[PDB]
Design an enzyme around this catalytic site. Structure first.
Site, mmCIF file in Angstrom:
data_model
loop_
_atom_site.group_PDB
_atom_site.id
_atom_site.type_symbol
_atom_site.label_atom_id
_atom_site.label_comp_id
_atom_site.label_asym_id
_atom_site.label_seq_id
_atom_site.Cartn_x
_atom_site.Cartn_y
_atom_site.Cartn_z
ATOM 1 C CB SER A 242 -1.079 -0.058 1.065
ATOM 2 O OG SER A 242 -0.566 0.029 2.437
ATOM 3 C CG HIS A 272 -0.857 -4.952 1.918
ATOM 4 N ND1 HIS A 272 -0.089 -5.071 2.931
ATOM 5 C CD2 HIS A 272 -0.878 -3.872 1.347
ATOM 6 C CE1 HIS A 272 0.187 -3.754 3.466
ATOM 7 N NE2 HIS A 272 -0.157 -3.062 2.159
ATOM 8 C CG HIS A 318 6.027 -8.858 7.970
ATOM 9 N ND1 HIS A 318 7.161 -7.897 7.461
ATOM 10 C CD2 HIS A 318 5.037 -8.521 8.319
ATOM 11 C CE1 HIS A 318 6.410 -6.727 7.325
ATOM 12 N NE2 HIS A 318 5.160 -7.029 7.863
ATOM 13 N NE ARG A 327 2.720 -3.878 12.246
ATOM 14 C CZ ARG A 327 2.296 -4.032 11.010
ATOM 15 N NH1 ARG A 327 1.693 -3.071 10.361
ATOM 16 N NH2 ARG A 327 2.598 -4.944 10.328
ATOM 17 C CG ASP A 373 -3.311 -8.185 8.774
ATOM 18 O OD1 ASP A 373 -3.498 -7.117 9.179
ATOM 19 O OD2 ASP A 373 -2.092 -8.401 7.976
#
Ligand SMILES: CC(C)(COP(=O)(O)OP(=O)(O)OC[C@H]1O[C@@H](n2cnc3c(N)ncnc32)[C@H](O)[C@@H]1OP(=O)(O)O)[C@@H](O)C(=O)NCCC(=O)NCCCC(=O)O
Ligand SMILES: CC(C)(COP(=O)(O)OP(=O)(O)OC[C@H]1O[C@@H](n2cnc3c(N)ncnc32)[C@H](O)[C@@H]1OP(=O)(O)O)[C@@H](O)C(=O)NCCC(=O)NCCCC(=O)O
Ligand SMILES: O=C([O-])CC(=O)C(=O)O
Ligand SMILES: O=C([O-])CC(=O)C(=O)O
EC number: 2.3.3.1
Lengths: 435, 435
Positions: A242, A272, A318, A327, A373
């Site tokens: 992105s 993504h 990743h 995160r 995610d």
């Protein structure tokens, strides 16, 4: 009194000179090499872009202008009576490199409340979209359609000198960020709360709070979740799909609305940001096949079946990180504080003990650890936001902060068209000899 | 009898093995280095992607699977009684690497006529768009909205094994190419021929011919122009903004509709395909300021004023080409054959004698020669297509051929996520020492 535009006016010229002299001394210095495998491998490992707002370390994770997440949590202004950082402050830090004051933070909040208004053609389009059109597609098409309002596009057409591009980019950036929650909330309501209205912006609230009110949520802890969510999903250095997409597109002088919409089509890819949605759907099929409380052996079998079917396990792996995403950890900590006994959360916790080991055993993934995610939707679901096809939109809204912050800088600094050279397999074989 | 899908089924496995062994031998071979200046410079000069369909030589210009434009003109199937290559044949060549037969070409034409149908939600959206919304924005939003029909998106959601991605990509590719002229013609009619209808596809005509009939043009030479235009604008290796954008976005597994729409937002940038529109607008202001027949000294002054105002001269320069674009030459030749006395054409010819010299004198541009955009709209205008804001859409329709051709191959070959590493100025200074 506070005016980010005036602050940037002073910062630009100094950074410009700094970069100028450095390039004078080291422009020809080599920073790496390119190998055949990197070209075939999606530039994995290639140092290819300058991106100022954040930098990711493969072991330590993301740093925003030099600060890690824990540091942001600690340093950034919170809402009155709040614990989570306000995304407005994170935007300030990214753009200026400095931690803002709460007074500076409140100005951003007012500025964004003041610029939030959708033109009717956009409203009409959203209202006429079918319910089977994915939320990310509705979001990207609406942002693209908002470009009729672009100030950069207009100024460019008027012939503005290139030295002033940043000024118009900044205005469209602030306006797009302001409008994003209304576009997003409107898709939410049309799809899942048909016949209701998003309501109006309260100039007195922070951006996350006006957003949650337009979504229709009252839980105060939900508002807290939103503030954290929107801050952490903000930026992840420049080579993620992105961000890179916004960068490349904006390099051609396409306006911020067109650059951001193209980024969103990249965020909607399963490899993504769409992974956030995919994690939940995988989990729901899990609990459906195996039913709520599963044994370890059963989870392993379930995981192996996915791998054996030529699919990825969503939420793990990743391209750069080589350890557990901070995160993900930051989300786990929120869960442990607020929803420690949720069965889905418990399932996500259990997979943390299993998945990495299976991936390691399979021996393909370079990073067998979870990424952001894997832990996002679980939080959302607990508060009542069960519409999993909509989760990526929230990531989209967050991501605007980092990419737009950088876009201002790209134009301030005069970065040129992104245009690498490509090669065919045949041409490359010849360049070397072949194989 | 003819079936490209079956032809690709045989070609895939062989290319896969070929690449496998080559990488076995040379994956670690270095093909270049990365310098500070390349990172700050939009990767100028970096060999960064594998792209099979075309390769551009800086001196010689583009080669499509090894053939230059003149060779395509000569080798590709023409329409009955035609002189210009049919874009269907160019698509065959790009996808297979082989020159097609006219029988193969006609099957592509029928396949594309057969798959051309727009869903109503898309039609409604177009019909409700305001006239001030730029044609490229209307085009990108419509393509994004067509993703509800994606077969790849659907198959992915069903869990298809990764080895079969190419098969679904191919179907969405063929369907998107088929529908593009209807989307494009519909925007044309809504904006400039309000109250009229695009009509229906004639399964018996070539794709360019059905397109020109939907646009409302009858001139047979116009149909010829369209065939050439659509063939030449088709692909330009992989690092150009639009192609690179489709590549990057598709690398995340976003469907072909989302990948193509993001590409279009990149083509709409003034430094990319929007230049075709910009050239015409610059020329119209030219003729307006100076009036139709200008002297050389007057054209120079006009050019210098643009440069002095911090603007680019549209249609000149290139990120890789270092000589006059063969695509510009190929257009000049069409002009000399068909509209040699047009005053605008004459103006474009005169600037060829002037502009490069001024750019050279200014000493900034690396390539002072014209690019494809400097000669495209002049042709269009002569035939009655005077709507300059719409020119980029035609480039968009052409570009689908090359980028979609490659997208099938990227998935066939299993290319992974495009994800380079980024760096901050601060981090980079430290990596070296600073400056
Ligand atoms: C994120 C990523 C695309 C990174 O890709 P890449 O850098 O190519 O991973 P890699 O170098 O480890 O890949 C090596 C191999 O391991 C496989 N692998 C990697 N992660 C895997 C996973 N989670 N499940 C299954 N296989 C996986 C790769 O697909 C690749 O296999 P092939 O060689 O057969 O192609 C990959 O880990 C993946 O597919 N993860 C699952 C999807 C996901 O969670 N995406 C969200 C990422 C965060 C975000 O952007 O929001
Ligand atoms: C095409 C391109 C963006 C390539 O950029 P790049 O590879 O950076 O060109 P470059 O290396 O020659 O640039 C060196 C300098 O010359 C300047 N320059 C290059 N082409 C110029 C032009 N046509 N007019 C004015 N200045 C120009 C550059 O902008 C740059 O100036 P700064 O150093 O002050 O930034 C550039 O030539 C340009 O702006 N051209 C005009 C726009 C155009 O015609 N675009 C269409 C291209 C084809 C297509 O994609 O359709
Ligand atoms: O860093 C990347 O490649 C992907 C990622 O986690 C993000 O964009 O948030
Ligand atoms: O090659 C590029 O950089 C630009 C170009 O001419 C195209 O995409 O047709």
């Amino acid at each position: 009194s506070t005016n980010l535009k005036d602050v940037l006016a002073s910062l630009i010229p100094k950074e410009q000179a700094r970069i100028k002299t450095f390039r004078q001394q080291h422009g020809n210095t080599a920073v790496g090499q390119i190998t055949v495998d990197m070209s075939y491998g999606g530039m994995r490992g290639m140092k290819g872009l300058i991106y100022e707002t954040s930098v990711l370390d493969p072991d330590e994770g993301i740093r925003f202008r030099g600060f890690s997440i824990p540091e942001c949590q600690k340093l950034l202004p919170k809402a009155g009576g709040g614990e989570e950082p306000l995304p407005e402050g994170l935007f300030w830090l990214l753009v200026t490199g400095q931690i803002p004051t709460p007074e500076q933070v409140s100005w951003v909040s007012k500025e964004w409340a003041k610029r939030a208004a959708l033109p009717s053609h956009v409203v009409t389009m959203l209202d006429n979209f079918p319910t089977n059109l994915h939320p990310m597609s509705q979001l990207s098409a609406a942002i693209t359609a908002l470009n009729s309002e672009s100030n950069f596009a207009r100024a460019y057409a008027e012939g503005i000198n290139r030295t002033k591009y940043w000024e118009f980019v900044y205005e469209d950036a602030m306006d797009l960020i302001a409008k994003l929650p209304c576009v997003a909330a409107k898709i939410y309501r049309n799809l899942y709360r048909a016949g209701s209205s998003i309501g109006a912006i309260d100039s007195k609230l922070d951006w996350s709070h006006n957003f949650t009110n337009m979504l229709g949520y009252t839980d105060p802890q939900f508002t807290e979740l939103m503030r954290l969510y929107l801050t952490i999903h903000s930026d992840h250095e420049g080579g993620n799909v992105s961000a890179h997409t916004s960068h490349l597109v904006g390099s051609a002088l396409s306006d911020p609305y067109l650059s951001f919409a193209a980024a969103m089509n990249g965020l909607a890819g399963p490899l993504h940001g769409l992974a956030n949605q995919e994690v939940l759907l995988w989990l729901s099929q899990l609990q459906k096949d195996l039913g709520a409380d599963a044994s370890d052996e059963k989870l392993r079998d379930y995981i192996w079946n996915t791998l054996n079917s030529g699919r990825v396990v969503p939420g793990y792996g990743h391209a750069v990180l080589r350890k557990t995403d901070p995160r993900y950890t930051c989300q786990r900590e929120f869960a442990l504080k607020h929803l420690p006994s949720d069965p889905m959360f418990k399932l996500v916790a259990q997979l943390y003990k299993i998945v990495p080991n299976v991936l390691l055993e399979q021996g393909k993934a370079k990073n067998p650890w979870p990424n952001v995610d894997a832990h996002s939707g679980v939080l959302l679901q607990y508060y009542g936001m069960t519409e999993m096809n909509y989760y990526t939109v929230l990531f989209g809204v967050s991501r605007a902060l980092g990419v737009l912050a950088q876009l201002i800088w790209s134009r301030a600094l005069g970065f040129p068209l992104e245009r690498p050279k490509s090669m065919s397999t045949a041409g490359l074989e010849k360049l070397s000899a072949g194989g």
